[PDB]
What we know:
Pathway: Phospholipid metabolism; phosphatidylinositol phosphate biosynthesis. ATP binds at residues 566-575, 601-609, 698-706. Residues 70-142 form the PI3K-RBD domain. Residues 540-546 are annotated as: G-loop. By secondary structure, the chain is an alpha+beta fold. It has 5 domains: 1-153, Ubiquitin-like (UB roll); 154-286, Sandwich (Immunoglobulin-like), CATH 2.60.40; 287-466, Serine Threonine Protein Phosphatase 5, Tetratricopeptide repeat; 467-620, 2-Layer Sandwich (Phosphatidylinositol 3-kinase Catalytic Subunit, Chain A, domain 4); 621-812, Phosphatidylinositol 3-/4-kinase, catalytic domain (Phosphatidylinositol 3-kinase Catalytic Subunit, Chain A, Domain 5, Orthogonal Bundle), CATH 1.10.1070. Helix 16 packs antiparallel against helix 22 (575-594). The structure holds the ligand Cn1ncc2c(NCCCS(C)(=O)=O)nc(-c3cccc4n[nH]cc34)nc21. Residues 543, 547, 568, 604, 616-619, 622-624, 627, 700-701 line the site of the ligand Cn1ncc2c(NCCCS(C)(=O)=O)nc(-c3cccc4n[nH]cc34)nc21.
Amino acid sequence: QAFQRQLTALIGYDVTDVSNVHDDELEFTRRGLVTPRMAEVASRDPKLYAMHPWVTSKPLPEYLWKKIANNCIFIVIHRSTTSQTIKVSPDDTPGAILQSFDFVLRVCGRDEYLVGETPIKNFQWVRHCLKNGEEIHVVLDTPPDPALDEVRKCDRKFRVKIRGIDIPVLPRNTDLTVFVEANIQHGQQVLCQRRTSPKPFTEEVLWNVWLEFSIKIKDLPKGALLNLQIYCLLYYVNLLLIDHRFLLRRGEYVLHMWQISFNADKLTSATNPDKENSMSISILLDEMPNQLRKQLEAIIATDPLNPLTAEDKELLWHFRYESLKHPKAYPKLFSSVKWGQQEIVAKTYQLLARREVWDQSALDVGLTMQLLDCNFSDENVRAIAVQKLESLEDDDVLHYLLQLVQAVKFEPYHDSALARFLLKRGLRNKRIGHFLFWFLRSEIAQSRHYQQRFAVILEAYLRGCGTAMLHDFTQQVQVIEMLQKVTLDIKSLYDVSSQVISQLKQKLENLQNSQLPESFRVPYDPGLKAGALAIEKCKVMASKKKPLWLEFKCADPTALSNETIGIIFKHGDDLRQDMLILQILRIMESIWETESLDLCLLPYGCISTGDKIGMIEIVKDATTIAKIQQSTVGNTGAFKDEVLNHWLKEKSPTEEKFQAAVERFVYSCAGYCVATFVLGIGDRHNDNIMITETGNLFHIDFGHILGNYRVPFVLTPDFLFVMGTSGKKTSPHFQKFQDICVKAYLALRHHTNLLIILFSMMLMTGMPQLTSKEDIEYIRDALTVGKNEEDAKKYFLDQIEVCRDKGWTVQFNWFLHLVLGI
Ligand SMILES: Cn1ncc2c(NCCCS(C)(=O)=O)nc(-c3cccc4n[nH]cc34)nc21
């Protein structure tokens, strides 16, 4: 019992609670997930699961090959005080290196292991070292005891009666009228729509009206939603017309509704938990011709957001067997399906049974993701997408985990192939499981629309993750809860007075002494194990949301460097938006990796842990672009061109390193101009832009520009100065920048459909305010869909020149708005 209690505290929600249900789908899902859990648990290798080797099967990039002398790679092994280097070949296994040198090779300071039958080059930690030009240091010790991971042992027209609506208290807006709109939805595609006669808007409105729809009962598709909405659009709520047992929903229902276009929340089957304040509604249920081929291929070629006309759909359907031969035609083909007709759906299933071309096609994530969005409610359609995902290596799963977790919001039922898939992969791998936990917990904490479903999924995971991880989560959760309290208490108290800096270090003193865990895993970096705080370095930050600047020691003695673990705790913004933006950045990098391109992005760790509150990784040796200018000229926005180049020469001791910084800067600057333009978040105040002492540029605080959402992006003259240019001039570096940009840009366009679906999904599940048809179709233009590589190339170069023609104009403007208040 104290176990289900522990689960509830780790989850942040009671999954056994049944106060907010009108059926047993949630409980049914708890039971159904048991099998999938035990199946994955009872078939994972204890040793490999305990050490969770982080590896990849992708080729080693060109830019990481040129980092290797010979077929040689050095690795420093450590034991007690002894310590020796070793010459290794990129292609030999960890076992080989051992005999070349029962113990195992663990990385210093990290809970990371170099184990398994894979080349030494196919490890992420090794590749990380090479990229950063770091040296691989491992300590030789015994493998973690796999025991520590032990797990606790019929032809009628459909009709619905609208009894009426009840609300305890209605807005002070006298006086208006209300009618109820009942839609039978599927995908976001409304099959049939009926309304009630308007009625005076009182706290109780009774119609007692039968709304007879055009669609026969037998023609109702599994997963179809009875969407009930109130107009003056004030309220909405949904009811699956066909339940989780293939039964036709029947009987009396009193649904509490959500108060207020492409938002995923509008899809939920969850009813509003707040029964005392929410609006309530009461209902009662009782050889193809040459030309046509071209036309079809042109249709199949268009982007995911390109709308299908009636003719387009009729064509796709009539030639469905020809369309079936094109995996890329699936999303559009299944959109051309009349789900409101049982005969058609039946034929669609007959079609799916002929999945030779699909089953054999190479995995296209962008394509797979499309079948998992709000446009598809059929579980058989969505199942083939999940099928293709099964072939993903744990490496790629981590890449798309966040948005796969978000895609669960588009599932009609709590129990889905997507859910079970995430459950399985999370249980198969500790790293995946770790992030799955936080991603789900993130949603469960600030999403009433989906907390129930995600809570049931999280519970299933926790019951199979193992004793060891359950303990880590417990420590991580405890720490986060304590620090959040401090961040809130501190926020309640401009300049960070002594009275507050004293209070902070004071509060931290109270916690550290006999309260906070002696050690905990860094949520955004599972390998790292944080120890005791360094109160001296801790401070409240000069931010309008008074974020905590915290620094910990590494609990790992074998750790090499003495550098502390820096974490920023912050309340005020929804960090989920930041997560999605940062995750996309990693996706853009992996993409660029396939092309062997390396823009030096810094997708720092960021984890949403609660309501408008989460933690951020502190990148070391970095400062604001604005701060580097506030030094030269403070109160006035008198930005000077050369200051940035000065700051670098200053921080780089050997002038050589300086040239390396100016290079790192040109790479990092191009990557952020391209990546930021595609995402339409490139117009930022230089306060939201930082640079490393090594010249690595990177944006920050993405939740800020998305919470209040004119130059294409930020290529200010001070950046240009570092590139050796001013005004009507060029360079050997600027040409380089313009060179890398067009490269980086053109490369992204080779994955247009992937970016589009991710961007679209990001907006619907993460940016509730940015959910219009126009908001989404921005990335189409940004990626200049359907354009020659030449045209596109020019398009971006125009964008660059527009930043030139602007100089400090917008920056200064930002200075007027943010800095002061104009
Ligand atoms: C990721 N990272 N690394 C350093 C750093 C930082 N450094 C603070 C020092 C800046 S200074 C003192 O040089 O002006 N501030 C922030 C940051 C602050 C506020 C909101 C944010 N959202 N996302 C990141 C945010 N992120 C940072």
